[PDB]
Paper text:
Ene-reductases (ERs), NAD(P)H-dependent flavoproteins from the old yellow enzyme (OYEs) family, are powerful biocatalysts for the asymmetric reduction of activated alkenes, generating the products up to two new stereogenic centers with excellent enantioselectivities. To expand the OYEs toolbox, a new thermophilic-like [name] ([name]) was identified from [name] strain NRRL3357. [name] could accept cyclic enones, acrylamide, nitroalkenes, and α, β-unsaturated aldehydes as substrates and had excellent enantioselectivity toward prochiral alkenes (> 99% ee).
The UV–VIS absorption spectra of the purified [name], released flavin, and standard FMN suggested that [name] contained an FMN molecule as its prosthetic group and the FMN was non-covalently bound to the protein. The further crystal structure of [name] revealed that the “cap” region from Ala132 to Thr182, the loop of Ser316 to Gly325, α short helix of Arg371 to Gln375, and the C-terminal “finger” structure endow the catalytic cavity of [name] quite deep and narrow, and flavin mononucleotide (FMN) heavily buried at the bottom of the active site tunnel. Meanwhile, the histidine pair (His211/His214) together with the highly conserved proton donor Tyr216 interacts with a buffer-sourced chloride anion and is positioned on the si-face of the isoalloxazine ring of FMN. It indicated that His/His together with Tyr 216 participated in the binding and correct orientation of substrate. The loop region from Ser316 to Gly325 runs on the enzyme surface and reaches the active site entrance, which contributes to the size and feature of the catalytic cavity. The C-terminal α helix of each monomer (from Thr395 to Phe401) points to the active sites of the adjacent monomer, and the “finger” residue Trp399 interacts with the respective FMN flavin group at a distance of 3.8 Å. The novel structure of the loop of Ser316 to Gly325 narrows the entrance of the catalytic pocket.
Residue numbers in the entry:
A (entry chain B): 15 to 402
B (entry chain A): 15 to 18, 21 to 402
Write the structure that this text describes.
Amino acid sequence: SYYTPAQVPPAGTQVEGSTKLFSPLTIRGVTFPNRLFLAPLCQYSAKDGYANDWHLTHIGGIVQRGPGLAIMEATAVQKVGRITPQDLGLYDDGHIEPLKRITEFAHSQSQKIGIQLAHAGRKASAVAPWLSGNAMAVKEVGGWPDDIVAPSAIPQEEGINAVPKVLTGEDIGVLKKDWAEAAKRAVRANFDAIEIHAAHGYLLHQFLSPVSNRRTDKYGGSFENRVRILLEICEEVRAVIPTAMPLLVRISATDWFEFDDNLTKEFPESWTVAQSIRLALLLADRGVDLVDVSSGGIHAKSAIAIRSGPGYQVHFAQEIKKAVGEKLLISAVGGIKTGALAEEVVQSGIDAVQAGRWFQQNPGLVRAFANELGVKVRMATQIDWSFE
Amino acid sequence: SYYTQVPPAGTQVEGSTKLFSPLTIRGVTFPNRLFLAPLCQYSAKDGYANDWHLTHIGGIVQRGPGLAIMEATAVQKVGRITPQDLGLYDDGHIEPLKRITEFAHSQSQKIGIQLAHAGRKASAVAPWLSGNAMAVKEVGGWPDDIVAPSAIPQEEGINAVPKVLTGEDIGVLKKDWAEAAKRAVRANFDAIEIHAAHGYLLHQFLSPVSNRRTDKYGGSFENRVRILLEICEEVRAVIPTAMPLLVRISATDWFEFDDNLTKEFPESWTVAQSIRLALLLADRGVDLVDVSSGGIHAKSAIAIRSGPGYQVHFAQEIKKAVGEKLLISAVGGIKTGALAEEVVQSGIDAVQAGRWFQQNPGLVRAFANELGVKVRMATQIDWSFE
Ligand SMILES: Cc1cc2nc3c(=O)[nH]c(=O)nc-3n(C[C@H](O)[C@H](O)[C@H](O)COP(=O)(O)O)c2cc1C
Ligand SMILES: Cc1cc2nc3c(=O)[nH]c(=O)nc-3n(C[C@H](O)[C@H](O)[C@H](O)COP(=O)(O)O)c2cc1C
Ligand SMILES: [Cl-]
Ligand SMILES: [Cl-]
């Protein structure tokens, strides 16, 4: 073989330097070149759940610049489980082909790509956040307010959201099968990893939290009952995806009520960090490789933790990681917006960090972090050449 | 109508800089005067655009350059710079480029493409392999088939000696430039640029260093500019009258600024000739000239340099000479918003940036921040700042 090109590592490889952040991480059959992941970040740009060239150019522009793993936004496992009418879906076989075009591009760059499987439950059929932080998408704009579902018939915010329909046991069986089928579709779309969304007040968190889950069947009313649907979904997803495939779960570490004097009185039973630790070990027992630690979402008084400060919920990730040790990988997310902070989080014992907004603000976040840390991390050949 | 506006990304929503003020050419309005300069990606096979080009251009267009000019795109197969260049020499090239213009248009953005021919600098390797070396046939090259006005290699002992274009070859070449322009129109580009710079084919005719012909295409100024004037006429005859037509020139071979190089190359391409040419181009429906420099010789490299605004003065000299008869853009190290605004406030109509966009696709927002103004991004991108 003549004129063989010089071999190069994937973009995102630490070619000079010894930071932990830009050191590789292997989970089962996949090696990520570094531990700075793109967090799932809804784009509100789809019709009928299909990815289009917005998603391809958005994700592709970031993947050119070497995140260790690029996790695609919340992708609904049921049509009625979309957050907005503009969400991605994996509930139709037709969804596979456009997503495959994105994974193909990532793989042309020798990059790793994942997707977050999701269901919004009682927070479904809402409008994009630039229209409202919480308002219904009515049927005339593609909404389905009459068809949203939940563990209990309680609206997210009364007077704003539709009252959800209560899932029956049969409905829960169908839901679990649909989660598994969406996972099978993600595999057919050639994703390298899958994440289950169990956070941010969406359907699985609605079962986890006694604030939203008032059921008295086997899916509510005790810790074992409240985590049951998530544990069952993890088992059934693991049963249908390759054993080589990393399985991630994103959780809300707490409803935050436990940390405020008044809110604890108002909601004396809620989802808490101690329950998250207990849950994390049960997840590890079912083949979940990594848990990403966010927080919030279950109530108007408990927003999704999208905040303005640095590393604002790293401490939850650290408490969980201290409790679980090497039995489970942990990633932190939230305001991890400089290289110094990202490296400090992983040096403290956290296995990886994720950034969401900071990648959309700066698709070259990896190189910014590398520059701050005084190390060299390869970009795409064309991009590195542009610095000449 | 129930449940019913935002301006395009790149619109100055607060502030009064000239840089982020709109510019109208014929039937097209650009929301600002910061353009993405043509920037080869060396990522194509057989001239076809692919998802590298789509994700590269799309990621920049999301962030609102007034006009995104796509890289040198060959009008003949043998006119590619490298075997990895884009082409518009085959109808098959239309649909992949159409996907890119479709995405730009979904963002209400304007997109152009640079039609090009490398002449005696064709069939070279990508620059990270060599600044100048032949792509041999075994790696997709065509050294035996490169063409030029005169049988003189770019660098002797490095580049193949080119075949001399005959009169009939020149007729075919002009028809191929026009056919590529027709294909660019069918791919739904908003604007077209003719590449007449950087030592490539049309500059090879312009400069007496490379053009030693004694037919009607060499040996005098009128003869040396002839092929470019004729190509501009042929292209204008086949594209919409509403379409902006740009030309990129090399302002000079640089030999005129050094006594020894003037002795060694007593006739070369010069700024004064660029001024004369610019007015002839304006007469033929060229709307805007972008001012670069260099390329014709090892002793005259393409001006890709490390300093700020390093050939702004050529653009200013040409703009002073042509006045309102022609629009002028500057390029080269225009890497901060303060500099870009100073350049346009000196009378230049627009500025272009190449490397600085690939380094930072959000260059527009960086420049706007430095200037203390607000320039809209795609809705999703502006939302990510909440
Ligand atoms: C516009 C937007 C969309 C988001 N979409 C998702 C999503 O689809 N899934 C998810 O789990 N989190 C989502 N999040 C939360 C982020 O993944 C992330 O956890 C949060 O923004 C904090 O990290 P950051 O400071 O790096 O952005 C979103 C956040 C924003 C601002
Ligand atoms: C990698 C690379 C590729 C380029 N490709 C082209 C091209 O296709 N056509 C062109 O006219 N100029 C091309 N240029 C020159 C640029 O358009 C630009 O004029 C030059 O890089 C200086 O401007 P800048 O400082 O903004 O990069 C290229 C430059 C580089 C570094
Ligand atoms: Cl979310
Ligand atoms: Cl060039």
